[PDB]
């Protein structure tokens, strides 16, 4: 028994083994304020690099969302669906982990945190914890400024950790604004209501939809707007032409101040509490070790602020739930195994002999895991519960003779 | 010819007099790029949570043949994701393993039972133990997957 | 089990979407029978509310439940806006994905998006067990009335 | 549906028939065209 104490303190811990799907998704995170035009260029540049790897056959990049409520992705976020060639076409010593390595090493741009995950895996992780990456840290509070400050520190300590490849926390107020601060008094002078002035913001400057054409089954948007030239920039907005009700020719600056500012980019809430998620990408180490190290680095080098809370969601959250259910599950399996022996042979002393024959089958598995180079997980965990009932089945067919 | 204003004369002022009416693109809410060599328009089939993907994908792949005739000349549907391909591989893998074990067990329960009828007893303990499980799953609602077959 | 609630609030800033649409929406969905957690997304003119239900909850019970709660909250929302119920699926439901391409050039991004939106979407949605055929990418033809200020 | 040009192109030149290449809601047209050369 005291010999199993070695492989034990040598193996890693994951929630589930990384199941390899025929293909995988590129998700790359970035700072809040990117423009659709640039982000879309970022997409094609990124795809060209992905496709430059011999193992991949198709690449389907996607910034923004698809027409469905099952997709609330910003135009700043990127999901690309990478299709890997048939396994019987990979280069010599090529393996999944090895492909991802050339991908994360080839496909990379400044200020862009790479993230590679199998589709089904990812789609489920997000539906469970919300985090797209295996390791996630949730900073919560009621002061966006505070929680952002926290996520930022936690962000940089995360990249000092041995096995982390990339760590980015989404900002809660990295959004950029051009404010049209309308001046009631100024506008009133021209006989204009706030609503009157605003029509130029929604339609003249912005391209608000005004109606739709009806073409058979289909519909298409109709809209009013000045040529882009008049709405190129702030200064342009300050000289935005306005024909007042009293046929006076003025400029937007005559009834409003236009100030550039910074504020919320997208308000993320969880149970009505604002929150920022820090996406961590570690794939060389085993999971549990990484998070256990993150928990240390974070604890020692980051002083929590009053309203701020830090948490470790992701798969690790699923792992902890399962372990509390397993440690409360062993006695169950140990009193049920205890009674089916208490019944077959009826002897109290005798049965305690058989059930006490399974701590020998445990050391057997652990040594094999280590040699096979595996990690502890709900996968292996299930194996030991099943294995127990077999060392207890055997335990009886040796006491039978 | 959307009328904006008209004199007593009967001389009207049209939308064309103050505006240019052009056909342009709406604001893209999502962008799709293929193989890093072009922007494209895509479509994604979404399955009702709790229903059969494999079952659905076939109906989809077949309906697409019905349409290859109806499609405009030069239009090509290149598939970018197919969950059906993984399913087949996964179910063929567990099937294969189920066959190997059976045989490797038989061969082994046939080298300790040196009579053929003795081996063919412990052997016919599987194709029967199988059926009972599969018959049960049908009353349960458990389809075949690496996890249901893995058991 | 996940029921989505998408609300559109055109032109309104994120902070306003949160205060007038999302927040009032998540706080009531939290006190929904069987609700485990609720995730809210307040964007520029969009409000995504994700309602996650506890294990062993009848999917269609959860829906029929959210619906009745939506009714007693529709009035607590801004005049124009209406809370829409999401599809019967989730992100995991993404099963088969394809791209539309014409290499000759005869058809462009707009033509293809239309092909998708008004032909393929309807040829596929009539398939059993399919909850939604979403258009991804492409261009939506728009009649742009560009006004000369002068 | 067809615009006449005073100058800029030569008879016979090829030209793509789409402003559908730059996102309406604000791809900065000047900078969006720049991305297509180098």
């Amino acid at each position: 028994v005291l010999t199993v104490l070695w492989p034990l303190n040598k193996v890693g811990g994951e929630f589930l083994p990384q199941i390899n799907e025929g293909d995988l998704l590129y998700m790359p995170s970035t700072l809040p304020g990117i423009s659709a035009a640039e982000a879309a260029s970022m997409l094609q540049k990124t795809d060209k690099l992905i496709m430059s790897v011999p193992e991949v056959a198709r690449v389907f990049g996607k910034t923004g969302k698809a027409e469905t409520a099952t997709d609330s992705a910003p135009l700043e976020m990127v999901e690309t669906t990478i299709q890997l060639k048939p396994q019987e076409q990979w280069r010599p010593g090529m393996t999944m982990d090895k492909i991802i390595e050339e991908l994360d090493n080839t496909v990379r741009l400044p200020g862009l945190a790479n993230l590679w995950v199998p589709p089904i895996r990812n789609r489920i992780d997000m539906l469970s914890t919300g985090i797209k990456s295996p390791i996630g840290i949730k900073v919560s509070g009621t002061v966006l400024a505070d929680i952002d400050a926290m996520a930022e520190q936690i962000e940089e300590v995360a990249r000092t950790v041995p096995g982390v490849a990339s760590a980015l926390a989404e900002r809660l107020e990295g959004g950029r604004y051009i404010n049209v601060e309308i001046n009631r008094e100024k506008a009133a002078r021209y006989g204009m209501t706030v609503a009157d002035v605003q029509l130029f913001v929604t339609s003249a400057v912005g391209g608000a939809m005004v109606g739709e054409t009806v073409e058979g089954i289909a519909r298409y948007p109709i809209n009013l707007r000045y040529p882009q030239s008049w709405r190129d920039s702030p200064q342009a907005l300050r000289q935005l032409p306005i024909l007042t009700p009293m046929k006076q020719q003025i400029t937007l600056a005559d009834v409003a101040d236009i100030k550039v500012s910074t504020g919320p980019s997208m308000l993320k809430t969880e149970n009505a509490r604002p929150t920022s998620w820090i996406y961590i990408d570690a794939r060389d180490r085993d999971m549990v070790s990484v998070v256990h190290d993150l928990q240390k680095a974070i604890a020692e080098k980051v002083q929590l602020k009053p309203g701020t809370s830090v948490a470790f969601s992701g798969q690790f959250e699923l792992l902890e739930r399962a372990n509390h259910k397993l440690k409360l599950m062993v006695p169950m399996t140990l009193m049920i195994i205890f009674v089916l022996l208490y019944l077959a042979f009826r002897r109290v002393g005798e049965a305690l002999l058989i059930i006490s024959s399974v701590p020998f089958a445990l050391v057997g598995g652990i040594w094999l895991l280590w040699w096979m180079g595996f990690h502890l997980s709900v996968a292996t965990g299930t194996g030991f519960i099943a294995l127990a009932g077999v060392a207890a089945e055997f335990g009886v067919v040796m006491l039978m003779y | 010819h959307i009328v904006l204003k008209a004199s007593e004369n009967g001389v009207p002022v049209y939308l064309r007099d103050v505006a240019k009416v052009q056909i342009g693109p709406e604001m893209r809410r999502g962008i799709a790029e293929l193989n890093g060599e072009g922007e494209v328009a895509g479509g994604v089939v979404i399955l009702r949570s709790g229903k059969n993907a494999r079952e659905v994908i076939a109906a989809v792949k077949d309906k697409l043949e019905t349409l290859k005739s109806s499609l405009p000349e030069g239009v090509e549907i290149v598939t970018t994701y197919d969950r059906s391909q993984l399913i087949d591989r996964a179910i063929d893998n567990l099937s294969g393993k189920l066959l190997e074990e059976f045989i490797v067990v038989a061969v082994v329960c046939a080298l300790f039972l040196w009579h053929v009828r003795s081996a063919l007893v412990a052997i016919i303990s599987l194709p029967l133990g199988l059926c009972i499980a599969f018959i049960v799953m049908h009353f349960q609602g458990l389809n075949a997957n690496i996890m249901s077959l893995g058991g | 089990v996940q029921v989505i609630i998408k609300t559109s609030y055109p032109g309104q800033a994120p902070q306003i979407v949160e205060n007038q649409v999302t927040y009032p929406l998540t706080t009531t969905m939290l006190s929904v029978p069987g609700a485990k957690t609720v995730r809210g997304f307040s964007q520029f003119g969009d409000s995504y509310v994700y309602v996650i239900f506890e294990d062993g909850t009848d999917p269609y019970w959860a829906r029929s439940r959210v619906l009745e709660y939506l009714n007693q909250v529709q009035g607590k929302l801004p005049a124009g806006v209406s809370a829409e119920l999401g599809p019967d699926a989730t992100g995991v439901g993404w099963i088969y994905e394809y791209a539309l391409v014409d290499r000759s050039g005869k058809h462009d991004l707009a033509d293809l998006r239309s092909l998708q939106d008004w032909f393929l979407k309807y040829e596929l949605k009539t398939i059993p067990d399919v909850a939604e055929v979403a258009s991804v990418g492409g261009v939506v033809k728009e009649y742009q009335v560009v006004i000369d200020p002068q | 549906g067809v615009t006449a040009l005073r100058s800029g192109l030569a008879e016979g030149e090829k030209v793509v028939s789409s402003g559908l290449f730059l996102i309406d809601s604000e791809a900065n047209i000047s900078g969006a065209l720049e991305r297509m050369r180098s």
Partner: peptide, 26 residues
């Protein structure tokens, strides 16, 4: 540290709708 280069400029090889400059009347 891959020195693998990609052409940054945009790309459109999946088809383009083209028309040629004609000399004619309005």
């Amino acid at each position: 540290a891959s020195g693998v280069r990609i052409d940054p400029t945009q790309t459109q090889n999946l088809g383009v709708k083209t028309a040629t400059v004609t000399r004619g009347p309005l």
